Amino acid sequence: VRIVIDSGVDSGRPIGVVPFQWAGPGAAPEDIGGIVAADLRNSGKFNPLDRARLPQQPGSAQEVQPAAWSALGIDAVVVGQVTPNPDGSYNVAYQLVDTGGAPGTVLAQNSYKVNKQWLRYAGHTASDEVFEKLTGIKGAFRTRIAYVVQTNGGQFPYELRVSDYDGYNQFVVHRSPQPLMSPAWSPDGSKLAYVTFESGRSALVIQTLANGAVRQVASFPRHNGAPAFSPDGSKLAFALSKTGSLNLYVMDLASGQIRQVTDGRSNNTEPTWFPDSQNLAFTSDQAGRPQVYKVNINGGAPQRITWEGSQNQDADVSSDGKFMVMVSSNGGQQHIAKQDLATGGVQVLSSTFLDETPSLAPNGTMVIYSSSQGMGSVLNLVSTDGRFKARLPATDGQVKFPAWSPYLHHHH
Amino acid sequence: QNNIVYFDLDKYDIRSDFAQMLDAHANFLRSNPSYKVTVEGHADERGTPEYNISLGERRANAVKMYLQGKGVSADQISIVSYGKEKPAVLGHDEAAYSKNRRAVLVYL
Secondary structure (H helix, E strand, O other): OEEEEEEEOOOOEEEOOOOOOOOOOOOOOOOOOHHHHHHHHHHOOEEEHHHOOOOOOOHHHHHHHHHHHHHHOOEEEEEEEEEOOOOOOOEEEEEEEHHHHHOOOOEEEEEEEOOOOHHHHHHHHHHHHHHHHHHHOOOOOOOOOEEEEEEOOOOEEEEEEEEEHHHOOOOOEEOOOOOEEEEEOHHHHHHHEEEEEOOOOEEEEEEOOOOOOOOEEEEOOOOEEEEHHHHHHHEEEEEEOOOOOOEEEEEEEEOEEEEEEOOOOOOOEEEEEEEOOOOEEEEEEOOOEEEEEEEEEEOOEEEEOOOOOOOEEEEEEEOOOEEEEEEEEOOOOOOEEEEEEOOOOOOOOOOOOOOEEEEEEEOOOOEEEEEEOOOOEEEEEEEEEOOOEEEEOOOOOOEEEEEEEEEEEEOO | OOOEEEOOOOOOOOOOOHHHHHHHHHHHHHHHOOOOOEEEOOOOOOHHHHHOOOOOOOOHHHHHHHHHHHHOOOOOOOOEEEEOOOOOOOOOOOHHHHHHEEEEEOOO
């Protein structure tokens, strides 16, 4: 997949991102300035100046002419250098230069030594530092996404894949003849839990990405699914329907001990953790149509928390616990909505068709989700203020079940 | 067509028109105690994947309870809900949705 932006950039903060200086003949091994500009645009917060229009192309902070940029309403410029090392690695350095009220002052700078295969990563690190310095929000440019691609035909039509957040460096985690569901990231970013029907029924598993190792979590009769790792690394929440309806369970990852959290005759599924690793939001149909409820895993009756439209489900709680996104339905349409968890206020974010499975970026500023376009599923992005909208189109196959990775604690 | 029960939106009850159909399966299962039926339950696309598993389950469980009421042993019936993961037909109108809200009896 790759990001295609549909709306929201024009209003963004103007910024200058200059092509990086290259200490060699011909083209640089990677366009680091291009990566930084794309990342900042993808955040929905910045409007990098077009290359046709750069007033100068300085290769260092000292070469910046602040007046050329203030004349364009640009208060910051990113410059940088890529240089080769004798061991075959590269240095990627950037400087962020104030071109507003402190003209010529360097606000931030760094240099990274990386192998050729990690040059995009170096670009994303620069983007993360620039983004955080200017906005005060931690950058998510070094994150990855997981998603399921379903092709037409073949012995293994279902693939769970992982890529960088912008689509690059895609790889296949697992191929299957039968549906795959609901990938979930461990907080250390090393594992995905997911559901597979390849055995003839559902099984919930955890796969280690680096080596493909698979741990079986649950394959009780009926459904085993809807995983979510606790932020503290200790637990996996999930839903089982062996009792006759979906209910919530938690596994202590160290011991493998499973404890039942809900025992309703209603269906209770789609758990998502609060930052404390003790409370879950989840979908229950206890009240009739699905709504989102919250419960502490240690005790107490679930409490209904949603009243928007006619029905609400499939929530994702933000990393700070201040809000959630969810799928809100009525009458006959379903969209991604954001609910403030202190006030109960709601804002509908999307207007696409059959919106589902929203997942927040770890800085809480962006939502990846899936919708229907023509006859098949696709991936969408919407900012949490609703202003920025983009897609992640694929060349082949339907794309669904996206999940945004945590922050960090042929490849290029 | 002699092995599929169809359902209305958010409904999971066995309609009279499928009684005869299911009676034939019950007869077979009673007469052949070694055979097991798998009831595969499905939902239409409206909703979300993990929740919609429950709509398929309610449909598949209704078939199971009907068969058990006709003397079939509980150990000759399994249910597997695919929620909205395995549509019979593609489309975004009731023509498609009605075709997709189903429980399918298969001898695997």
